[PDB]
Ligand binder design. Sequence first.
Ligand code: HEC
Ligand code: HEC
Lengths: 143, 143
Amino acid sequence: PAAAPNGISLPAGYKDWKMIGVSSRIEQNNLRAILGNDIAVKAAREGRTHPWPDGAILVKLSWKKSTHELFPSAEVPGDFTQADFMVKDAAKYASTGGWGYARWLGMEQKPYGANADFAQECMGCHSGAKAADYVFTHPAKLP
Amino acid sequence: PAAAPNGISLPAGYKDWKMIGVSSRIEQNNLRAILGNDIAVKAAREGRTHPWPDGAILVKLSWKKSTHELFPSAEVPGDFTQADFMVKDAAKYASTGGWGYARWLGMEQKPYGANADFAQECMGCHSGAKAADYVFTHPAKLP
Ligand code: HEC
Ligand code: HEC
């Protein structure tokens, strides 16, 4: 697809990345998966998040919630809504907290944002997670 | 970890597997990730699920729901509760629909089940999905 307005290209092969976590956002009626590239997954598992290392890429995949036709108390993914990315590069992206933000919308993978300054929107909320290097997600615990 | 009572060993390396989907089970207050080995992932993506191919392994990972401390409308994983597996081998597990069922509990990874017949409990619900080869999960759609 086209690059984001800030020049970030869609990372190839994100659908094959390893899982960091999952979430449900009540207020938007979605389910999400949080994946990362191998730098991000190694950092997440080792607790090297203060700060995250350069080269880490986080992706959040979002779907509308639907209910399973055979088991109504199971909320399961419906339509795909968006892919959100954060790319760590402390020098390149110093103006947005050391992260390159990007979003692509829908199955059509339309880049989000009116202009190259769109990431200030993202920062508006993510600045609340400054103490955790602008990342809300806590990696899910596994054995 | 100890093998399940039906002889199934815990698949090594499952935390490095690719994502098939995610879910939320309302009645359990759990968030879940569904991963699969590469045989399962290929089959899921290609629609070769009638029946699933031998060697496919699905894993469901479950965590208690907890709300994010910075964003209370975000439901996120808390304590890890269990890993559920289904191993396809049509001939070997013909008596349980062609799938080997197994569950390990908690971080401590205690095998579930009183005896080797424990998988009948799993079949009790999964038989409702018999027309879909005993699998409820619909692979999440991605571009
Ligand atoms: C999740 C996110 C992720 C994963 C990394 C993380 O911080 O956990 C990415 C790559 C990303 N966002 Fe943001 N986002 C918010 C919250 C609370 C969470 C965690 C809970 C969940 O799984 O949903 C996020 C909050 C917000 C927010 C507040 C209303 C805004 C405006 C944004 N996020 C905006 C953005 C982006 C702007 C286009 C962007 C690329 C994001 N988030 C990336
Ligand atoms: C999910 C499951 C998975 C993933 C494959 C699938 O069928 O989607 C595995 C490997 C597994 N179960 Fe089962 N299970 C149930 C439902 C509705 C879902 C889909 C929704 C979700 O993501 O949670 C499942 C339902 C039930 C159920 C009804 C009360 C029982 C008793 C069980 N499941 C039991 C078992 C197992 C017995 C130990 C076992 C190994 C399972 N499930 C594996």
